[PDB]
Design a protein around this motif. Structure first.
Motif, PDB file in Angstrom:
ATOM      1  N   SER A  81       0.848  -1.184   0.000  1.00 35.66           N
ATOM      2  CA  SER A  81       0.000   0.000   0.000  1.00 35.66           C
ATOM      3  C   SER A  81       0.888   1.240   0.000  1.00 35.66           C
ATOM      4  O   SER A  81       2.111   1.135  -0.102  1.00 35.66           O
ATOM      5  N   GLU A  82       0.273   2.410   0.120  1.00 33.31           N
ATOM      6  CA  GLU A  82       1.026   3.659   0.119  1.00 33.31           C
ATOM      7  C   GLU A  82       1.909   3.812   1.361  1.00 33.31           C
ATOM      8  O   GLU A  82       3.086   4.164   1.258  1.00 33.31           O
ATOM      9  N   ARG A  83       1.342   3.544   2.532  1.00 34.86           N
ATOM     10  CA  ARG A  83       2.082   3.662   3.785  1.00 34.86           C
ATOM     11  C   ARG A  83       2.346   2.298   4.419  1.00 34.86           C
ATOM     12  O   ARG A  83       1.527   1.383   4.297  1.00 34.86           O
ATOM     13  N   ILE A  84       3.493   2.163   5.084  1.00 34.59           N
ATOM     14  CA  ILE A  84       3.854   0.907   5.736  1.00 34.59           C
ATOM     15  C   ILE A  84       3.154   0.831   7.091  1.00 34.59           C
ATOM     16  O   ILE A  84       2.292  -0.022   7.294  1.00 34.59           O
ATOM     17  N   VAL A  85       3.517   1.714   8.016  1.00 37.03           N
ATOM     18  CA  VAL A  85       2.844   1.748   9.309  1.00 37.03           C
ATOM     19  C   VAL A  85       1.688   2.710   9.067  1.00 37.03           C
ATOM     20  O   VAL A  85       1.903   3.879   8.774  1.00 37.03           O
ATOM     21  N   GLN A  86       0.461   2.220   9.181  1.00 39.25           N
ATOM     22  CA  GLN A  86      -0.697   3.050   8.893  1.00 39.25           C
ATOM     23  C   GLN A  86      -0.879   4.262   9.793  1.00 39.25           C
ATOM     24  O   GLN A  86      -0.943   5.389   9.312  1.00 39.25           O
ATOM     25  N   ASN A  87      -0.960   4.030  11.095  1.00 41.56           N
ATOM     26  CA  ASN A  87      -1.164   5.111  12.048  1.00 41.56           C
ATOM     27  C   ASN A  87      -0.685   4.668  13.425  1.00 41.56           C
ATOM     28  O   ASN A  87       0.046   3.685  13.542  1.00 41.56           O
ATOM     29  N   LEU A  88      -1.100   5.387  14.461  1.00 44.03           N
ATOM     30  CA  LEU A  88      -0.693   5.062  15.826  1.00 44.03           C
ATOM     31  C   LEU A  88      -1.393   3.815  16.355  1.00 44.03           C
ATOM     32  O   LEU A  88      -0.959   3.231  17.346  1.00 44.03           O
ATOM     33  N   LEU A  89      -2.469   3.409  15.684  1.00 43.59           N
ATOM     34  CA  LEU A  89      -3.223   2.224  16.071  1.00 43.59           C
ATOM     35  C   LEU A  89      -2.685   0.954  15.421  1.00 43.59           C
ATOM     36  O   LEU A  89      -3.036  -0.146  15.839  1.00 43.59           O
ATOM     37  N   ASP A  90      -1.846   1.110  14.399  1.00 46.60           N
ATOM     38  CA  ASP A  90      -1.269  -0.031  13.686  1.00 46.60           C
ATOM     39  C   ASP A  90      -0.178  -0.656  14.545  1.00 46.60           C
ATOM     40  O   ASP A  90       1.016  -0.479  14.297  1.00 46.60           O
TER      41      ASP A  90
END
Length: 390
Positions: free
Chosen positions: A7-16
């Motif tokens: 996908s575009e980002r590896i670590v999605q957010n702080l919840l990933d």
């Protein structure tokens, strides 16, 4: 024409990340807010990761840019055992790149963490999932989600064509595969696949983001880290394990009651798992050594304490796959409640691809060594084994 695996980002957010990282983080805020710890990344196959340094550091900047969204924080806020002071802390949290050191020494990639336990705890999972995916983006750029769903379907078919519907109605399975996933996209696909087409009972995921995204129950016991830190936080080494459990139960008053037994050795854990702890905790998690012998020991201990095994739960999550997990279920079903957790064999099963063998282990707490022995084969480890009787 196939859907790319990345996908575009590896670590999605702080919840990933894994849920138990948050529950543990809260325990730290409330009980050991100013404790300091040290961690160190390690590649067990000595795979040459030197060429990933640039991308890794690039992802590090990205991490420092992350700030929790209001919708994300609200999702967490709705969880009753997450306190308002902790929620506010997360609302203001930002990764501090100063607690991370990465580079090359001895012609080998290295990454170390040092800082307040409160602020460094969140680095662990994302770093692993991130290093994993940058490697995979370099090693297998043509990889596709398609290939992932394929092998997932094969395993699902195997399960259907192996276990009766009666067994499957009791086969409890969870996803714990964030850290060594092939990529975020694959992980998301696998978990969606589980939610929709798992022959047994899919109970949830440890990944908070996917739990919110797919509307699944976030799962997570306690980590070795919690038990290891107590070896330097204050009590005698010989009391460290009981002190860790005591603080956990005092923090969560009976909730999140699944304890790990191998920070030292299951035998040592059991000698100290008295009636008080046995009544409070709903069960135990197996993470090393033979699973069936481990069960005999835990079940035998409950019996001697006068505790009915069928009122407790055993969670298995030691590098399991569907076959190995099914065997354990068939063996123990009827004697004690059991549930299972599968990680990399779910989130990183691509044709021709071998999962990375990496870890970010805690090495010290408040300037002093901590360690894990486990049931699997300096002077600190010697004295530790000695007081616990190896």
């Amino acid at each position: 024409l196939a859907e790319s695996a990345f996908s575009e980002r590896i670590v999605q957010n702080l919840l990933d990340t894994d849920f138990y990282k948050l529950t543990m983080m809260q325990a730290v805020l409330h009980n050991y807010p100013n404790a300091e710890v040290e961690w160190e990344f390690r590649c067990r196959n000595q795979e040459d990761l030197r060429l990933y340094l640039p991308a890794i550091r690039e992802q590090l900047e990205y991490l420092a840019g992350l700030a929790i969204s209001d919708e994300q924080l609200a999702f967490l806020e709705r969880i009753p055992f997450l306190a308002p002071d902790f929620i506010r802390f997360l609302g203001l949290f930002r990764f501090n790149p100063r607690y991370v050191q990465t580079g090359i020494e001895n012609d080998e990639f290295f990454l170390r963490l040092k800082g307040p336990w409160l602020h460094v705890i969140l680095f662990e999972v994302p770093l692993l999932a991130m290093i994993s995916e940058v490697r995979n983006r370099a090693r297998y750029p043509a990889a596709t989600v398609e290939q992932a769903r394929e092998r997932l379907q094969e395993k699902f078919d195997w399960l259907r064509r192996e276990a009766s519907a009666e067994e499957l109605a009791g086969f409890k399975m969870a996803d714990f595969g964030t850290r060594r996933r092939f990529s975020y996209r694959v992980h998301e696909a696998v978990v969606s696949g589980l939610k929709e087409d798992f022959p047994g009972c899919f109970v949830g995921t440890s990944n908070v983001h996917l739990a919110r995204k797919l509307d699944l129950k976030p799962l997570g016991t306690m980590a070795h880290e919690w038990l290891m830190a107590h070896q330097q936080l204050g009590p005698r080494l010989i009391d460290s394990q009981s002190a860790a459990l005591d603080c956990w139960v005092r923090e969560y008053r009976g909730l999140l009651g699944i304890a790990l037994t191998d920070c030292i050795t299951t035998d040592a854990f059991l000698r100290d798992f008295d009636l008080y702890f046995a009544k409070l905790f709903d069960g135990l998690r197996h993470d090393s050594g033979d699973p069936l012998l481990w069960a005999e020991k835990t079940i035998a201990h409950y019996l001697k304490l006068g505790i009915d095994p069928l009122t407790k739960t055993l969670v298995f999550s030691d590098g399991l796959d569907l076959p190995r997990a099914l065997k354990i279920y068939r063996a123990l079903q009827g004697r004690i409640n059991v549930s299972f957790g599968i990680g990399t064999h779910f989130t990183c099963d691509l044709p021709g691809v071998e999962p990375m063998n990496i870890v970010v282990k805690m090495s010290a707490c408040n300037g002093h060594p901590v360690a894990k022995i486990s049931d699997t084969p300096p002077d600190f480890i010697h004295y530790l084994k000695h007081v616990f009787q190896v």
